[PDB]
Tab-separated table of C-alpha atoms and ligand atoms in Angstrom:
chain	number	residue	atom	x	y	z
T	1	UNK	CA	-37.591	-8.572	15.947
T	2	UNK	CA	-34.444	-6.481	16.990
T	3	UNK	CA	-36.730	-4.588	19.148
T	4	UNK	CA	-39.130	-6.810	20.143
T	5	UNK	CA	-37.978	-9.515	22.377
T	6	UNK	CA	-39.371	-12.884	21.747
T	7	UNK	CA	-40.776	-14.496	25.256
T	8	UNK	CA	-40.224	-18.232	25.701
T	9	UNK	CA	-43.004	-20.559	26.214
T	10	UNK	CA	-43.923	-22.214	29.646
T	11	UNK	CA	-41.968	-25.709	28.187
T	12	UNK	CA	-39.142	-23.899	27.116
T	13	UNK	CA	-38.630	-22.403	30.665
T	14	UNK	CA	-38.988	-25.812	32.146
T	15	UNK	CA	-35.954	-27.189	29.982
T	16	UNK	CA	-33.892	-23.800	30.951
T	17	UNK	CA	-34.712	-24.058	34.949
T	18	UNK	CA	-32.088	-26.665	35.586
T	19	UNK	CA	-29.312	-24.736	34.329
T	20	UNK	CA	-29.728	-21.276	36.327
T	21	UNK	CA	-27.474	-22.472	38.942
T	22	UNK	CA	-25.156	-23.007	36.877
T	23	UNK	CA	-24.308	-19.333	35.010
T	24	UNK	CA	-21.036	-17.501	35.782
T	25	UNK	CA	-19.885	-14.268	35.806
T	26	UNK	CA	-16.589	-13.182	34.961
T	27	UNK	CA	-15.217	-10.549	37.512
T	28	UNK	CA	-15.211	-6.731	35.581
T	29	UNK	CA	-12.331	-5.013	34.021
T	30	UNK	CA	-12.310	-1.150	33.446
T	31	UNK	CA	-11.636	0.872	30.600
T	32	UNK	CA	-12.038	4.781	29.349
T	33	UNK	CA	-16.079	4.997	29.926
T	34	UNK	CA	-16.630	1.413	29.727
T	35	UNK	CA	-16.602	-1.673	32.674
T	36	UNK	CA	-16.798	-4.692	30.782
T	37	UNK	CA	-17.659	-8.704	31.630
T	38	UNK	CA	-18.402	-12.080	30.499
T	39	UNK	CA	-21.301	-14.489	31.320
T	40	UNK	CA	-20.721	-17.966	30.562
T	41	UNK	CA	-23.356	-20.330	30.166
T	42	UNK	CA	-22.436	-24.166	30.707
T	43	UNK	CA	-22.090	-25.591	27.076
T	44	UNK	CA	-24.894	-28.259	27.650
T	45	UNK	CA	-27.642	-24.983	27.760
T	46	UNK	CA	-26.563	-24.296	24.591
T	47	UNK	CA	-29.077	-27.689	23.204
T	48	UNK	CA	-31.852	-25.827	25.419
T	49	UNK	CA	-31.759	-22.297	24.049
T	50	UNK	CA	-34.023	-21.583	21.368
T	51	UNK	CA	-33.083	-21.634	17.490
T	52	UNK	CA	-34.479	-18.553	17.079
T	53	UNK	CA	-32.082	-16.948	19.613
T	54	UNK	CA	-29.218	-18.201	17.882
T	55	UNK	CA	-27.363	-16.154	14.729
T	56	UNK	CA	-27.950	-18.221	11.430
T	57	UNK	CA	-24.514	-17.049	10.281
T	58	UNK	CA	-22.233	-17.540	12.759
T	59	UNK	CA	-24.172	-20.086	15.386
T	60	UNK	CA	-23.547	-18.238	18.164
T	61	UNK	CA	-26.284	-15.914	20.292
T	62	UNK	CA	-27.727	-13.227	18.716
T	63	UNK	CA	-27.776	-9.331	20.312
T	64	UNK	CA	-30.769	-10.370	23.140
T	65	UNK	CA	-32.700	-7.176	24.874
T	66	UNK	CA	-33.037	-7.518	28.700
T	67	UNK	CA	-36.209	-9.338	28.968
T	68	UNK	CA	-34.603	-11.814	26.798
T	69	UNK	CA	-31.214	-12.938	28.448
T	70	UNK	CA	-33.166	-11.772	31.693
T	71	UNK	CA	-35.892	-15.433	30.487
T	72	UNK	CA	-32.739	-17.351	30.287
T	73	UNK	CA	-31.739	-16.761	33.904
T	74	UNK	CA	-29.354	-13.960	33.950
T	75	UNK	CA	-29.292	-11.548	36.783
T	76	UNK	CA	-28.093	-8.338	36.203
T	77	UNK	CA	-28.126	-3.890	36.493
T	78	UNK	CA	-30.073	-2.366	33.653
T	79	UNK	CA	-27.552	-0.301	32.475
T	80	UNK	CA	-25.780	-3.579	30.537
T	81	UNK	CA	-25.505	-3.981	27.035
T	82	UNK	CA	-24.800	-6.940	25.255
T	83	UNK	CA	-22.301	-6.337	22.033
T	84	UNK	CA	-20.492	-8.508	19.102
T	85	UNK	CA	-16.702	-8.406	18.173
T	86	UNK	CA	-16.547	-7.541	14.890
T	87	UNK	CA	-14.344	-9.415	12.074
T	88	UNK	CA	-12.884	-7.264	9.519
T	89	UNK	CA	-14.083	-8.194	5.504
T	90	UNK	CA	-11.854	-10.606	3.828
T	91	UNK	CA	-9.984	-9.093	1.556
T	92	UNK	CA	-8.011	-6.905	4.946
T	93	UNK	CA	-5.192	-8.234	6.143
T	94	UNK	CA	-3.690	-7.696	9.777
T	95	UNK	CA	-0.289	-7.687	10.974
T	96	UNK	CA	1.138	-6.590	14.073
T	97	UNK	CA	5.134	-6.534	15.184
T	98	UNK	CA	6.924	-5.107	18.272
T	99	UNK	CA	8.154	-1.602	18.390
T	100	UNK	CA	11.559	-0.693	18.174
T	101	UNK	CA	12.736	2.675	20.240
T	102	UNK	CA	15.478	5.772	20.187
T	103	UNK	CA	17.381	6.752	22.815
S	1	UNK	CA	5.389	-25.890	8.064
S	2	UNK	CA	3.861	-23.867	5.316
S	3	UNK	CA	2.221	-24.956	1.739
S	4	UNK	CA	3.575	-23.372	-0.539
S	5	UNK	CA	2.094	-21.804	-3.771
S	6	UNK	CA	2.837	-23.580	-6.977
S	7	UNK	CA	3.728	-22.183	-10.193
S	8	UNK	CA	0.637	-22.523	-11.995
S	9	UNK	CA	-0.987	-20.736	-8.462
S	10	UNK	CA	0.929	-17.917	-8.527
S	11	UNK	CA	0.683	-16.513	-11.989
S	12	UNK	CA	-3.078	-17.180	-11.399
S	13	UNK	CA	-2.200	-14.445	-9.092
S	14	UNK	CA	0.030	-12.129	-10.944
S	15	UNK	CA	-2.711	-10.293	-12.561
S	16	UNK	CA	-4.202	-8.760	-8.961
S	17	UNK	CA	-0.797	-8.089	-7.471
S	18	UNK	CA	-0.436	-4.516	-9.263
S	19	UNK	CA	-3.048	-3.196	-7.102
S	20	UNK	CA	-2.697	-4.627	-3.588
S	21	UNK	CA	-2.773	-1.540	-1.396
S	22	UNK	CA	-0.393	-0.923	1.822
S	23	UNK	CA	-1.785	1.089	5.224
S	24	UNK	CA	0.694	3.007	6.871
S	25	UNK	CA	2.169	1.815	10.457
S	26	UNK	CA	0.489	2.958	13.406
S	27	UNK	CA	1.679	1.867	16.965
S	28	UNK	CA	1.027	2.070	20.467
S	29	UNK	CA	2.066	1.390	24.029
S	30	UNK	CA	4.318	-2.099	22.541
S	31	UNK	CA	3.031	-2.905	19.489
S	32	UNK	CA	3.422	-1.526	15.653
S	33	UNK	CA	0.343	-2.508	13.369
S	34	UNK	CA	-0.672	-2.260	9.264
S	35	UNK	CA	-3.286	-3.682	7.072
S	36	UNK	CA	-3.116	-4.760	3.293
S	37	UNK	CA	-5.933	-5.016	1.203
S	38	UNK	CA	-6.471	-6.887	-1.490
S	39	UNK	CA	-8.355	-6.634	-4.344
S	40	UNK	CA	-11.866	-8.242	-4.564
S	41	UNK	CA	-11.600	-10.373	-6.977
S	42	UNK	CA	-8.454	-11.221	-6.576
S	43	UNK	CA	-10.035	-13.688	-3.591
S	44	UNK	CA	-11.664	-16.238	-6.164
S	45	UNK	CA	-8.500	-16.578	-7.379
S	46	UNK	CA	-6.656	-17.983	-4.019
S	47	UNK	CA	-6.108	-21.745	-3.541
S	48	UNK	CA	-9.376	-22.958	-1.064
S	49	UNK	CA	-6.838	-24.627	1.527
S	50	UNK	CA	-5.573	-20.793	2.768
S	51	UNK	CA	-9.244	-20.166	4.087
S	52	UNK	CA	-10.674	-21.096	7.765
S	53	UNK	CA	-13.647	-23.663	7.062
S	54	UNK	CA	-15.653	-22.132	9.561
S	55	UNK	CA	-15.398	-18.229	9.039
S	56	UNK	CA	-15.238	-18.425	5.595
S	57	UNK	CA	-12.288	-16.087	5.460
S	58	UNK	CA	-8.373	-16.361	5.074
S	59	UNK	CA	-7.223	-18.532	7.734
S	60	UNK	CA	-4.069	-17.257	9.125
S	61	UNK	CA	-0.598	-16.982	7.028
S	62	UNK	CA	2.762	-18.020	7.935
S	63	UNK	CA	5.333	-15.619	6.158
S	64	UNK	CA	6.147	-17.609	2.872
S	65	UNK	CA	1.947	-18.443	2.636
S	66	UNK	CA	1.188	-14.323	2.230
S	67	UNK	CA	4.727	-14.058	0.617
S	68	UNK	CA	3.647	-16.272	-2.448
S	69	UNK	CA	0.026	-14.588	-2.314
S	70	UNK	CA	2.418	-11.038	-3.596
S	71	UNK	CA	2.595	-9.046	-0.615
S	72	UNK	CA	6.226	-7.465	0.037
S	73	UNK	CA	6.934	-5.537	3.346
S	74	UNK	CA	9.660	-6.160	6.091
S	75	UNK	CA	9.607	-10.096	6.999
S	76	UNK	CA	9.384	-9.212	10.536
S	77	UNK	CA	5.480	-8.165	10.258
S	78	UNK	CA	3.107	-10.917	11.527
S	79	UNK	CA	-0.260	-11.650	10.437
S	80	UNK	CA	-3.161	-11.988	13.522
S	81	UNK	CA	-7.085	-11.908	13.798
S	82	UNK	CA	-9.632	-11.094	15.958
S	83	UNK	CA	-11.872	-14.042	16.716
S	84	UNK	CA	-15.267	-14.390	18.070
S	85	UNK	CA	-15.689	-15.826	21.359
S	86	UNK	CA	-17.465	-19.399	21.934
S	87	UNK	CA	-21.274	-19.920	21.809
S	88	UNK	CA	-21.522	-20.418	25.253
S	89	UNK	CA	-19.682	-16.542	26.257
S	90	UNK	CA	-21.794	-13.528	26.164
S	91	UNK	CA	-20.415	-10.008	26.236
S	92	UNK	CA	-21.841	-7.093	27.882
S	93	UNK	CA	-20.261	-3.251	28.425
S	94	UNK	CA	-21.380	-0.827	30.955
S	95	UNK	CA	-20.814	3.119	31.425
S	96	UNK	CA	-21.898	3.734	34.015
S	97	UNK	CA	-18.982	6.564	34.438
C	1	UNK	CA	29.151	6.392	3.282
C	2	UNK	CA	25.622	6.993	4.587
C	3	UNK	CA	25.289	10.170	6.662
C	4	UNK	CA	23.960	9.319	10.122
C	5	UNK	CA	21.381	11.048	11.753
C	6	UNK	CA	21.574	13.332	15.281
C	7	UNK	CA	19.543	12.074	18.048
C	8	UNK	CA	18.223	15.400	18.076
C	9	UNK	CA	17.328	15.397	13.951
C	10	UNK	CA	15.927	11.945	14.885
C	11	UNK	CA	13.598	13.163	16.929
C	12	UNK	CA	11.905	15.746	15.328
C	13	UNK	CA	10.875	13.065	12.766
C	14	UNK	CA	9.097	10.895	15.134
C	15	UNK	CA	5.490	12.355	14.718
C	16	UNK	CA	5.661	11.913	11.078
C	17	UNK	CA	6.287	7.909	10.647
C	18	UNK	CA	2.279	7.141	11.412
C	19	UNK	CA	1.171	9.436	8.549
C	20	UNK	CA	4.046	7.654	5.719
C	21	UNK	CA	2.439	6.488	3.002
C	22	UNK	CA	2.871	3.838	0.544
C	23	UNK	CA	1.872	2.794	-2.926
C	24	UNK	CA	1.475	-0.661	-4.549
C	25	UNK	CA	4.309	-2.613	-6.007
C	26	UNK	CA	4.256	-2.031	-10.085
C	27	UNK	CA	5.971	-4.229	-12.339
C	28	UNK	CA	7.447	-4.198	-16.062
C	29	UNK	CA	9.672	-6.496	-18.292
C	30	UNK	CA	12.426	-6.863	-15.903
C	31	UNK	CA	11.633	-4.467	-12.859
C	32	UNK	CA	9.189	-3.437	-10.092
C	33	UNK	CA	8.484	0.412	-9.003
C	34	UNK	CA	6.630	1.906	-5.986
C	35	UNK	CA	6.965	5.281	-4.366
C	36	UNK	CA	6.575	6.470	-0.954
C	37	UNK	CA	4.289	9.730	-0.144
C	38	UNK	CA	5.973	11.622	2.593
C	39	UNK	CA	3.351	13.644	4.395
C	40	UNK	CA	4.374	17.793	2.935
C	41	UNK	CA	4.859	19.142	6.661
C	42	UNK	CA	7.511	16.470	7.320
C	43	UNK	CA	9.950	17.983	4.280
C	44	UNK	CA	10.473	21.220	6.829
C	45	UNK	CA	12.089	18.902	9.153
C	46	UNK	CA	14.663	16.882	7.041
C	47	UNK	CA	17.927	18.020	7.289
C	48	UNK	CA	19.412	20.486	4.616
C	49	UNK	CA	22.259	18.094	3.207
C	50	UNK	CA	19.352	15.349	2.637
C	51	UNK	CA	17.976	17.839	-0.182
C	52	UNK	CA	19.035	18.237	-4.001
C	53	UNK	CA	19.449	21.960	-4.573
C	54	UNK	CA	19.182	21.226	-8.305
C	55	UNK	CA	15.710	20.097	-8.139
C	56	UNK	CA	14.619	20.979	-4.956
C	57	UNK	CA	13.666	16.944	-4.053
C	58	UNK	CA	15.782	14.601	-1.925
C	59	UNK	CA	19.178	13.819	-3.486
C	60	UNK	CA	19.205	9.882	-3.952
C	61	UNK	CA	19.220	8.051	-0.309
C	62	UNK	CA	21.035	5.193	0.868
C	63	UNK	CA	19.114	2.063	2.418
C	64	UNK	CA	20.340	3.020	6.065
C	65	UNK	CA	19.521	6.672	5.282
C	66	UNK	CA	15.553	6.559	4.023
C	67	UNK	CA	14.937	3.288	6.771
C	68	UNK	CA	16.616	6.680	9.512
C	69	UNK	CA	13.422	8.926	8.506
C	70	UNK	CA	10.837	6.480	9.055
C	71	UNK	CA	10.324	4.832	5.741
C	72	UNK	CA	9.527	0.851	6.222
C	73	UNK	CA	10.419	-1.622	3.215
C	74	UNK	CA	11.331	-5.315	2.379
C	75	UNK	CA	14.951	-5.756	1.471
C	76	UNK	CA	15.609	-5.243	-2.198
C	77	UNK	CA	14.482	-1.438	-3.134
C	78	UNK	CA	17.225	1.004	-4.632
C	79	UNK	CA	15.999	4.831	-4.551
C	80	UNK	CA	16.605	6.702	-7.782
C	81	UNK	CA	16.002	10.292	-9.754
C	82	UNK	CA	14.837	11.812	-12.723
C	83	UNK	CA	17.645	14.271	-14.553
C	84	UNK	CA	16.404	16.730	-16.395
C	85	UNK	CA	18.769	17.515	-19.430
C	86	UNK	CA	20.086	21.117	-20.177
C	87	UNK	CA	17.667	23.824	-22.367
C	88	UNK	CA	20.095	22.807	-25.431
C	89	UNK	CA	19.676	18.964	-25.448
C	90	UNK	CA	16.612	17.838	-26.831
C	91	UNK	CA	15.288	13.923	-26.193
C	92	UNK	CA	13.657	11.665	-28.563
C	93	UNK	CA	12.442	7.889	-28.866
C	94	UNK	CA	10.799	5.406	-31.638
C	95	UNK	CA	8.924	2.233	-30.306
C	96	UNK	CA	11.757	-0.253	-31.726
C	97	UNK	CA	11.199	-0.341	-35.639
J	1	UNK	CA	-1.467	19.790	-24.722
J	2	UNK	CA	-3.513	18.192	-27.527
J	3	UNK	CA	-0.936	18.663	-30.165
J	4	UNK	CA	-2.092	19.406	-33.444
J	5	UNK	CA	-1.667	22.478	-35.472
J	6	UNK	CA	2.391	22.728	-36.212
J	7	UNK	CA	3.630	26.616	-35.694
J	8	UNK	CA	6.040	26.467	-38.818
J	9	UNK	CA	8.959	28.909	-38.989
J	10	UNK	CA	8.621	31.765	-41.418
J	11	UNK	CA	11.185	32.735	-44.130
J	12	UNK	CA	12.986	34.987	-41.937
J	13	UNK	CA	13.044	33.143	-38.528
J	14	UNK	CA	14.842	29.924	-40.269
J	15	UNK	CA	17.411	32.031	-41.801
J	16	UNK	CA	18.196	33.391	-38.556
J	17	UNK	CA	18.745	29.849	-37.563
J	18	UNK	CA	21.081	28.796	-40.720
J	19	UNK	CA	24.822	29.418	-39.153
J	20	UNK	CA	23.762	26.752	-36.238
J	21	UNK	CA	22.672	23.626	-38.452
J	22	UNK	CA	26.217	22.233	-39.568
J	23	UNK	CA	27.134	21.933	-35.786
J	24	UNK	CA	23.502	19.858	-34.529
J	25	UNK	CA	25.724	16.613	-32.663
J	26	UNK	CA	23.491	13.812	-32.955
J	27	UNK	CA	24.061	10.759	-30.268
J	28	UNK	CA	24.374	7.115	-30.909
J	29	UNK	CA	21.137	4.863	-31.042
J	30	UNK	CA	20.205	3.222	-27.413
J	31	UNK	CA	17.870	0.582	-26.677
J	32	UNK	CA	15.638	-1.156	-24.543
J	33	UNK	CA	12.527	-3.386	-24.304
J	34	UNK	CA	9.697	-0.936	-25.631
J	35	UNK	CA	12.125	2.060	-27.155
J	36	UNK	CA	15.083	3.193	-29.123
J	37	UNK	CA	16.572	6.321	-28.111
J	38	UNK	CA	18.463	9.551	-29.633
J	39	UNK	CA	20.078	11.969	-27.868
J	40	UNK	CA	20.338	15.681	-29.923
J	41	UNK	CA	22.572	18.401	-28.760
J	42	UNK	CA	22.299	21.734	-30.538
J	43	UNK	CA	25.135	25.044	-29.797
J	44	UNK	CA	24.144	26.886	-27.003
J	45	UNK	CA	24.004	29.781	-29.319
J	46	UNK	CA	21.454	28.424	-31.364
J	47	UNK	CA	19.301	28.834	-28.593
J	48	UNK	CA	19.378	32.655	-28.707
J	49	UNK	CA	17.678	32.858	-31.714
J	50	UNK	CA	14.961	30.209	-31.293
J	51	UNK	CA	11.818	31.590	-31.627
J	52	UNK	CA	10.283	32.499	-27.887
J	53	UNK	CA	6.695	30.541	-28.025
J	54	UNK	CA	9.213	27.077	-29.369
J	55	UNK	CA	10.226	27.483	-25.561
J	56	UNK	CA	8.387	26.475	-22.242
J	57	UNK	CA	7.465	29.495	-19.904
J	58	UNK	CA	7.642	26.882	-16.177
J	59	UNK	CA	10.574	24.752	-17.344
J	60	UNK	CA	12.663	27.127	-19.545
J	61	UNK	CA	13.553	24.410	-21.778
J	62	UNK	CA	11.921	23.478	-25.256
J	63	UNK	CA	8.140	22.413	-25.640
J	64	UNK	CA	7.702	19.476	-26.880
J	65	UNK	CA	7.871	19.300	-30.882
J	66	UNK	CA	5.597	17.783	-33.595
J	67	UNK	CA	7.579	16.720	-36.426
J	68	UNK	CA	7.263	19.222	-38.609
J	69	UNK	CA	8.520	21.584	-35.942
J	70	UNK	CA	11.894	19.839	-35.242
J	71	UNK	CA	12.368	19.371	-38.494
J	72	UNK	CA	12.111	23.043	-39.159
J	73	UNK	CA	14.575	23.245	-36.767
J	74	UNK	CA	17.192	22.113	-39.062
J	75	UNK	CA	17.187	18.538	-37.069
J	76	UNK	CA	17.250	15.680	-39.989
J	77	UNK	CA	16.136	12.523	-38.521
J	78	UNK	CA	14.442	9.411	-39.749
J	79	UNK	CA	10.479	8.999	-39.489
J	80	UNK	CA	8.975	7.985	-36.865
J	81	UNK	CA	11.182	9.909	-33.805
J	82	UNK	CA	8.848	11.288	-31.454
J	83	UNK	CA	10.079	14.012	-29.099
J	84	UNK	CA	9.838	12.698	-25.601
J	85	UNK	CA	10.255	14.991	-22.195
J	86	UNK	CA	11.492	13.649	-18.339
J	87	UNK	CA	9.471	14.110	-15.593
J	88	UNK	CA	10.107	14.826	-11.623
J	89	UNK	CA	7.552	14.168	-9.116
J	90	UNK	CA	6.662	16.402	-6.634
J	91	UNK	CA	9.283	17.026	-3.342
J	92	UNK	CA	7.407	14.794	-0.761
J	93	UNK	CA	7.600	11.671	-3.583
J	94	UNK	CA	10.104	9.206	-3.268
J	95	UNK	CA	11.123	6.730	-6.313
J	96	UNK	CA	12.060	3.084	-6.200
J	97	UNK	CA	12.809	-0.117	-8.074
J	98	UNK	CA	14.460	-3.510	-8.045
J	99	UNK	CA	14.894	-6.404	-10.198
J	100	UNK	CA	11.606	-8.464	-10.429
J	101	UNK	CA	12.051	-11.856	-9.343
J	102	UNK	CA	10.501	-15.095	-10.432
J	103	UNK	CA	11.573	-18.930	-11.454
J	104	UNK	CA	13.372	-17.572	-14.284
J	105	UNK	CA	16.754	-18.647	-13.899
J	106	UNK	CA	15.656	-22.276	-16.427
J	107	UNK	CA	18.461	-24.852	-15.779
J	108	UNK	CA	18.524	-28.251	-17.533
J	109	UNK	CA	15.764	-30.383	-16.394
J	110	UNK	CA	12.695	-29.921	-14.162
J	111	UNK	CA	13.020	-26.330	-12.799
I	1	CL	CL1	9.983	-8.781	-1.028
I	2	CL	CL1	7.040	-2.757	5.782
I	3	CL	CL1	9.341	10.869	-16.968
């Protein structure tokens, strides 16, 4: 419970299994402090995962701790955190338009 | 092709437009950005077809759609968002220096 | 005839135009206001013919003029002043009876 | 200022005052939406011999007048003027407007 990770059951593992092969990893881009990357699990494990491991507003994954995403068969250093974009509320407005220069 | 407001939409609006607040312009390496917010309630008051179904926000405005909602500023500003990845992508960040 | 900036005047404006700010657009019988907060540092670096020695404020700027220091607007604004009569003329008003 | 208690001349200040009232110019009437507006130009002289607390200390002009205090003043003007005052904003303030637009141009049939 956002600290505790929730350990799957022996069935659960069984349905996960055949899909462990088929995980990919996006090659890493740098940044100031940061190295960043994407896993990408093949949309038919998405009907496997657990409910509970999904966000019940937004239906995507939830923030999982290592033993967690480690259960669903990803391999990877310690030092990785997983992280969520965040949306901005709506009632902000973006907008965005190229620069103009002096010379 | 936008959809436009009508007249009975936009005086439902006319009441919030007085206090729709302007960021200043901040830019970097090619880009120039700003924000406007709007009021709260003023939200309740917009016509249900300018929101996204699935994020349950304002879906995204074509000049005369944010225009007609009372927001004034040089035409050549767009309007973006940031959206969340698929289901099926997880993100992860490392230091490590 | 607006007054053109130097490319050297220009330029010592630049660090100012992320720090511009702007208020909401106010409206009345037949008219809309809104003013624009230049940041106090910035008024050291405007040219001395942009100023009103009568006041001590920026004499009444042309379109091309206030969009050459940095100010960003839709099309439509006019800038204006407030005059200040003489000590010997006094002002009055009645709410039309 | 909360306005209240009128500082009426004494006998001797308004006679001091007397060889200015014949030449008070009063302007025509303007108008607007909310207002009607007077303009009232007393002799330069006159000013001289206005009492010193009638003035303001920042702006050097007059401070705003109940009516009993204008009208002691030798200005003769109809009930219900109030003395108004003009206002500039501060140096880094800028000041627009435009002409609000709407469907308000009504033409013949379905506008
Ligand atoms: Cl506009
Ligand atoms: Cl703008
Ligand atoms: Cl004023």
């Amino acid at each position: 419970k956002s600290g505790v990770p929730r350990l799957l059951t022996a069935s659960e593992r069984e349905r996960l299994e055949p899909f462990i092969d088929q995980i990919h990893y996006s090659p890493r881009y740098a940044d100031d402090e940061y190295e960043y990357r994407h896993v990408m699990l093949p949309k038919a494990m998405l009907k496997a995962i657990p409910t509970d491991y999904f966000n019940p507003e937004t239906g995507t994954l939830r923030i999982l701790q290592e033993e967690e995403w480690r259960g669903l068969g990803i391999t990877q250093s310690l030092g990785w955190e997983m992280y969520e974009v965040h949306v901005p509320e709506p009632h902000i407005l973006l907008f965005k338009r190229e620069k103009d220069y002096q010379m």
